[PDB]
């Protein structure tokens, strides 16, 4: 049947709207479910490594799985409470870890491939085509975008290079290491972090296994680091109607500083990841997440330390919340690199329609 | 045959046609000679010409934006899946028809879109377009009490020019220095701006100094426009606020010299952001916003 | 000049030097404190005859002082206004021992023209005047402080790391009938452990405490009303050194937003040299915080820094124990505790 | 808990250092453009320190200068210097003998070995010896050792594994390995004689050496009646675990936090790096200890020292030290990269990861590769170097030269080639 | 003043449970009557209603979450002419201020003709609801205006039927009910 209330730690005063509880730990659920599901929700849930690009190609993955497991029942048709299958997966996925804006493109895949062979066929037919389309999709939307998107990147350097970078995207990731090998150009990386989630710390180790020049930093250790430094990279997770960047955290502040700094900032994006949900702030909608993302105490994650914190619920009066997911600043970031190459960022919804 | 030699052929006289008109009725010229029913032997040879002519260049820019135009122009053209002869000729037409155009777009920009200086709206004006000038000689025969003012071009004196095309319609005018250009944005009412293109992020690609300008128009809150003929829609991009496709050097540090040889390479060239543009005057209607990377998208269909 | 006279004279330079270098000595104010009895100890021993001469010692000294530690500015500054207040008893002294006019309290024309007594008792209060003032700077603040800040506004702080803003804001917290909610950016290779501290206190004092993390700033900036910095030393432009990290940015927001940033100090931390470089002053901490390994960790050349500057121009009042001042201002307070030629040794 | 003496035991380790120490003292010598002396001693006074001895022996009249020169050497110190003079080389064995005779042991006397700079509050470390010896009277010495880089691989002159205690601090095995440089003896052992009495066997071998060590009254004593032990951490420490005077207790300090010795080259200058970086807490030079000095600290981790001068661009990669006195010409490519006090560039010259001590001439185009050039020492034109080459004392590389990897170079004016006199060897010129 | 907007504010109100308080400009020459119906209005419903001085808005600003317009006429570059008094200066105050600007539209409401100057598209006021008595008309000048226009600079959104847009992109949205032909008639 499921499980619901008892929740950690006090709600504070303001903020207070999406869902930020719950199973951590499994106690006693319903009895047909299919175990993948449930596992990349524990993943997801416990994930430390996630950043908008890989997530919606691991639910995809998932996806196609499933569907190689699934079996057509010996009475009713192949979609009768597959439809109430999904549905309940949904409910466990955004009691986990909410649905982003490529997941619910993803949904409406799924639904729109749904309508499209309508009850009538067998099993080993009409599943070995659904199998093979969805992967020529995942190859079309997804990959070769992406290697557009690097290509597209190369050229945009020109000569001498000094850099500032942050977050875990994966596509930055790609990039950042293609002007390392393949381009041999003169690519200095600085790395900027952040404490809710070790991207940073990832980027850097990445860096490593292919033996960059690598300065690191974070948030507020930046008034020296411009004292010849030039270009500026980030990675959004989504656009929304409105032009805005909403993506996670650490971005906007950085932004600014480049902005005073007199050099611009350059972001990328996908051609699949556009929204017709339309807000202008953080309050509306919003990645929030449990308090324990702030307990350790610097250096590393795994260290528990007793030293001077270590309590919530006993704390009488004291309201400890952070933010994951951000609305950066309009007009802030210059370029930005999707699928027709290049262009600014007042195009919005120039692709929503287009579908 | 030669593009490049066709080019030659215009110097001297010219103000008139569109520059970017000329380049396409020279390429459509060099077109119609070799045979444009195959595919094969045209195309690539066309791309090819493009390459050498853009090789070629001395400190020209619009000519690869018109190509790419006559490009597109061509590709839209065998669409229609009937047969090879009709639209070959139909193409060969369209070359002199688009030179025919400019003029028409010319006439339509200098009668319709006029309306931004009436009451006595005093101009502060630099880049020379041929555009700007018309529709300002055009606005002469109206006597709606016009006022101009010149910040001074000093590639090689083109200011002088500038006055001496002013001085036929007989309107007092004043010469402006560019350094005393945070000294007088008070009597004059708005910026407006003759340019070379305009970019894929929205902001101008311009000459000697404006991005200068831009920034006092910013700051005065009195607005900053931009007036041509439109198809300069290149594709480009400046990323930063210090890199184009440039000519000449990018600010080139010169040596420990001697006598006052090494110095006059002063940028030429300057450019500046997509959030300036107040309004854009186009003859395809008065459209601004997000009108030219809209554009841009419906030509390549990204 | 060296130690070459100051041997079975005065003796606890040494000392000093020692607590400067290994940082042993802790807090600007107990810098202060040290360097003030020193002077004492100073004062009390060494023998005089003349008076010229002594000065120049003293320049020397507080030259040496200089150079055995820069980033101590309170150190100094004391030293200065010791200096000064023996200064103005010395000018008294030669008008009395010759034996004038002025628009005002001081002159530019009169450095153009041609221009045994008990100055030691003088010299010796100076110190005791100089220990009062550094003794409460807070109970001559709030009375220009529980006055900017009104009901259901909201507050950003910055730098939990001197001792008199923390107190500062308890004194607002204090009133019944006040209310404000409190936004606490974290500041993180440098300031953590102290941030959390702080706002471990704020949570005792039965207020709305708010713990944010350095990057979420900009997801809340819509709701700020107030910047304040806590700040360890001030300078001749208006501008301030401050206690570590996680400032500067902040402030920057701040000054984007428009949002009204204040500065709370003290004249002890009034400083009479200019902040030419940032480079000269401000320190760095210590790479090895960050990360663990070393082998790969030559590879890793992280860049940290403890102390923080920021520019005259985000920042408009320095309310002090003698009242709210301004950066265009503060200049004459400075001349006003320390003298004309005492600005270089 | 105070008053507390000093020995340390200098003119020890020479020849380690194959090429150098030959003319002159080997603590003599300047590390980052001045003496590794004042390091440890600046060190020691942190601890606590109340008299200074040191053991010079290999020149002693030059130490006996330097000593003179020095600030600890003029009344105000809470410690004056007396070195001790003996007969010339004797091991540790015979120096704790001629110690004893003088007799001038007290309590806690502290003895540290080679040259040591590190960052640890010392004052936390002497209150738990302190503790630990007001536990049982049989308590003996202090061992310090620090947590490594994770794994261990530029490790082979000294990686000893130590088996330890949790419950008491107290090593258990002592064993020395070529394992990672010659693969012949890939090998473990541990011994019974403490194993039905600790229970918790922690493995180990990621620990550093360090070398310095609080020792109580039994010390000397013990030295003086087992006269096997002419060394301090092999035969000594093994002979403690076998209980050759029985039921004694010793320690094992363990700090999260970064401690090392001074042994060979390539471990010099990853010392070298270490300090100049932000790697131990609060050591710099910026601060100036020896009073002469003139350095101030820069951005992106560069050293200037007032007098220091370099030329208009030169693009620069990361971490780069000046010493005063300084002449750079124009167009040079440096990461990475100290050149010492006085020292004067040409032009053109492309130098990575690489040492340079005092007075030393890199000559017009020249490349320098993690490389090292020694006082008085000069690079003429055209010198191409690679990975570790050594260059000893006023050796005059002249014109135009070729050495490959690691080729060492002698400094007396032996055994190994490449000499004193003009051009290093490829066209034989010398004694 | 529409009765559009006071419906979009009652259903917001409708959910009470989301918290929102009212500052109403009372609109010198001929918003006043219509202000004050508003205010009625809102007290009908129970919310909470504050009554504002045209002169006193930088007084107010910093403390004003979001902002919402009713507007008559919207157009090309982004602006909007607004149902009469006190919208330019707000709007200034604003800018300033940094403040969210909500704007309810329509696309009928919409018109793809451009503004180009103040010099014409501003619509003044009447003399009549100012001062009476005409013989100290001789020698002043009374200046005041009913309906006026906005900069583009300002507003930020454009809640519609189909959704919220950008003032530098709304031209596309006319143009997909409108032409660059049917212009200039």
């Given at each position: 049947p499921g499980i619901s209330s008892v929740i950690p730690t006090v709600l504070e005063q303001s903020f207070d709207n999406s869902s930020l509880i719950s199973v951590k730990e499994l106690l006693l659920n319903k009895d047909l479910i299919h175990p993948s599901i449930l596992l990349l929700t524990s993943h997801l849930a416990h994930y430390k490594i996630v950043g908008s690009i890989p997530r919606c190609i691991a639910m995809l993955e998932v996806f196609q799985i499933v569907i190689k497991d699934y079996q057509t029942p010996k009475g009713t048709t192949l979609s009768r409470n597959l439809t109430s299958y999904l549905s309940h997966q949904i409910d466990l996925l955004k009691k986990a870890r909410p649905l982003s804006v490529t997941m619910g493109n993803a949904i409406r895949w799924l639904k729109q491939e749904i309508s499209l062979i309508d009850p009538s066929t067998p099993d080993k037919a009409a599943k070995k085509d659904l199998c093979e389309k969805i992967g020529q999709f995942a190859k079309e939307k997804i990959e070769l975008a992406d290697q557009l998107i690097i290509d597209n990147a190369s050229t945009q350097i020109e000569e001498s290079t000094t850099i500032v970078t942050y977050g875990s995207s994966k596509v930055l990731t790609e990039l950042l290491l293609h002007n390392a090998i393949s381009l041999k150009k003169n690519i200095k990386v600085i790395v900027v972090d952040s404490r809710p989630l070790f991207e940073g710390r990832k980027m850097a180790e990445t860096l490593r296994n292919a033996g960059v020049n690598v300065m690191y930093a974070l948030i507020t250790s930046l008034d020296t680091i411009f004292n010849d430094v030039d270009y500026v990279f980030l990675g959004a997770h989504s656009i929304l109607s409105?032009?805005?960047?909403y993506s996670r955290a650490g971005t906007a502040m950085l932004a600014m500083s480049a902005k005073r700094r007199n050099i611009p900032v350059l972001v990328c994006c996908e051609s699949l990841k556009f929204s017709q949900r339309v807000q202008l702030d953080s309050v509306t909608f919003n990645e929030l997440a449990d308090p324990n993302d702030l307990v350790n105490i610097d250096y590393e994650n795994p260290v528990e330390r007793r030293g001077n914190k270590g309590a919530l619920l006993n704390q009488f009066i004291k309201e400890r919340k952070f933010e994951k997911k951000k609305l950066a600043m309009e007009n802030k970031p210059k370029g930005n690199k999707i699928g027709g190459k290049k262009g600014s960022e007042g195009e919005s919804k120039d692709a929503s329609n287009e579908e | 045959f030669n593009i490049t030699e066709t080019y030659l052929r215009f110097l001297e006289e010219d103000t008139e046609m569109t520059m970017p008109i000329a380049a396409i009725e020279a390429l459509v010229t060099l077109l119609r000679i070799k045979t444009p029913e195959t595919a094969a032997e045209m195309i690539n040879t066309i791309k090819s010409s493009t390459e050498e002519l853009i090789k070629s260049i001395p400190n020209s820019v619009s000519l690869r934006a018109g190509c790419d135009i006559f490009m597109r122009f061509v590709l839209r053209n065998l669409h229609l899946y009937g047969d090879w002869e009709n639209c070959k000729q139909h193409l060969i037409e369209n070359g002199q028809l688009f030179v025919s155009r400019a003029k028409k777009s010319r006439n339509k920009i200098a009668e319709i879109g006029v309306d931004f200086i009436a009451d006595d709206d005093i101009i502060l004006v630099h880049g020379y377009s041929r555009a700007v000038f018309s529709l300002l000689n055009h606005a002469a025969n109206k006597f709606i009490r016009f006022r101009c003012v010149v910040t001074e071009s000093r590639p090689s004196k083109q200011g002088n020019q500038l006055y001496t095309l002013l001085e036929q319609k007989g309107i007092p005018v004043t010469l402006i220095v560019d350094s005393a250009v945070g000294a007088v944005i008070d009597k004059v009412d708005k910026v407006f701006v003759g340019a070379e293109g305009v970019a894929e992020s929205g902001g101008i690609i311009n000459l000697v100094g404006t991005y200068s300008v831009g920034v006092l128009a910013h700051n005065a809150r009195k607005p900053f426009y931009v007036v041509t003929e439109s198809h300069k829609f290149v594709r480009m991009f400046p990323l930063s606020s210090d890199d184009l496709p440039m000519a000449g050097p990018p600010l080139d540090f010169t040596r420990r010299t001697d006598d006052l040889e090494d110095a006059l390479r002063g940028p030429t060239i300057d450019y500046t952001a997509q959030e300036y543009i107040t309004a854009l005057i186009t003859d395809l209607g008065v459209l601004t916003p997000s009108a030219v990377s809209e554009e841009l998208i419906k030509m390549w269909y990204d | 000049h060296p130690n070459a006279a100051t041997s079975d004279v005065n003796v606890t330079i040494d000392t000093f030097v020692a607590k400067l270098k290994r940082r042993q000595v802790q807090g600007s104010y107990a810098i202060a404190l040290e360097t003030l009895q020193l002077l004492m100890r100073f004062i009390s021993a060494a023998r005089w005859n003349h008076v010229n001469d002594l000065i120049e010692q003293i320049r020397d000294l507080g030259n040496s002082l200089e150079k055995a530690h820069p980033t101590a500015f309170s150190c100094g500054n004391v030293i200065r206004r010791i200096l000064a207040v023996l200064r103005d008893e010395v000018e008294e002294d030669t008008m009395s021992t010759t034996v004038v006019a002025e628009p005002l309290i001081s002159s530019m024309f009169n450095l153009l023209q041609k221009p045994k007594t008990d100055y030691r008792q003088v010299a010796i209060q100076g110190i005791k005047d100089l220990i009062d003032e550094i003794k409460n700077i807070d109970e001559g603040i709030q009375q220009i402080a529980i006055d900017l800040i009104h009901d259901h506004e909201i507050l950003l702080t910055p730098t939990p790391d001197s001792k008199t803003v923390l107190k500062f804001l308890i004194t607002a917290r204090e009133r019944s009938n006040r209310t404000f909610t409190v936004l606490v950016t974290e500041g993180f290779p440098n300031n953590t452990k102290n941030a959390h501290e702080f706002a471990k206190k704020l949570a005792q004092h039965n207020i709305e405490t708010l713990v944010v993390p350095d990057s979420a700033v900009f997801a809340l900036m819509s709701r700020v009303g107030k910047v304040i910095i806590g700040t360890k030393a001030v300078f001749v432009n208006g501008g301030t050194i401050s206690s570590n990290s996680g400032v500067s940015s902040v402030c920057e927001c701040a000054r984007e937003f428009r949002t009204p940033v204040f500065a709370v100090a003290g004249l002890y931390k009034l400083s009479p040299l200019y902040p030419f470089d940032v480079e000269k002053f401000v320190e760095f901490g210590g790479s090895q915080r960050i990360l663990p390994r070393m082998d790969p960790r030559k590879r890793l050349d992280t860049v940290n820094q403890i102390t923080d500057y920021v520019p005259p121009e985000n920042i408009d009042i320095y309310i002090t124990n003698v009242g709210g001042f301004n950066p265009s201002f503060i200049y004459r307070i400075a001349w006003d505790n320390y003298k004309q030629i005492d600005v270089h040794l | 808990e105070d008053r507390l003496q000093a020995v340390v035991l200098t003119d020890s380790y020479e020849t380690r250092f194959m090429p150098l120490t030959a003319v002159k003292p080997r603590c003599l010598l300047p590390l980052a453009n001045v003496p590794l002396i004042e390091y440890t001693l600046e060190f020691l006074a942190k601890a606590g320190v109340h008299e200074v001895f040191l053991i010079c022996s290999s020149h002693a009249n030059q130490i006996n200068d330097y000593i003179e020169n020095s600030k600890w050497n003029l009344p105000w110190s809470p410690f004056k210097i007396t070195t001790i003079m003996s007969p010339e080389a004797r091991c540790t064995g015979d120096v704790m003998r001629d110690l004893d005779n003088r007799g001038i042991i007290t309590g806690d006397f502290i003895l540290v070995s080679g040259d040591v700079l590190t960052n640890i509050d010392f004052s936390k470390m002497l209150e738990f010896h302190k503790k630990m010896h007001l536990q049982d009277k049989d308590h003996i010495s202090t061992m310090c050792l620090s947590k490594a880089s994770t794994y261990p691989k530029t490790r082979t002159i000294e990686p000893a594994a130590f088996v330890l205690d949790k419950s008491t601090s107290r090593c258990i095995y002592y064993q020395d390995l070529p394992l990672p440089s010659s693969r012949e003896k890939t090998s473990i052992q541990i011994d019974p004689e403490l194993l039905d009495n600790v229970d918790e066997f922690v493995i180990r071998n990621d620990l550093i050496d360090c070398r310095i060590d609080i020792c109580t009254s039994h010390v000397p004593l013990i030295f003086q009646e087992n006269f096997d032990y002419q060394s301090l951490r092999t035969d000594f420490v093994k002979g403690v675990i076998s209980s050759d005077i029985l039921g004694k207790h010793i320690y094992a300090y363990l700090t999260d936090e970064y401690a090392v010795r001074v042994e060979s080259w390539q471990t010099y200058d990853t010392i070298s790096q270490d300090f100049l970086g932000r790697w131990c807490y609060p050591l710099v030079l910026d601060s100036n200890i020896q009073d002469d000095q003139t350095y101030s600290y820069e951005s992106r981790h560069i050293y200037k020292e007032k007098d220091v001068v370099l030329a208009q661009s030169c693009k620069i990669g990361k971490c780069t030290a000046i010493g005063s006195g300084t002449k750079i010409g124009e167009g040079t490519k440096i990461e990475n990269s100290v050149i010492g006090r006085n020292c004067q560039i040409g032009e053109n010259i492309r130098i990575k990861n690489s040492f340079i001590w005092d007075d030393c001439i890199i000559g017009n185009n020249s490349i320098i590769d993690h490389s090292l050039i020694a006082s008085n020492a000069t690079l003429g034109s055209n010198v191409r170097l690679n990975d570790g080459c050594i260059i000893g004392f006023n050796v005059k590389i002249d014109d135009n030269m070729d050495l490959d990897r690691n080729t060492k170079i002698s400094a007396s004016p032996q055994d190994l080639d490449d000499q004193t006199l003009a051009v290093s060897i490829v066209g034989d010129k010398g004694v």
């Open positions: 409105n032009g805005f960047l | - | - | -």
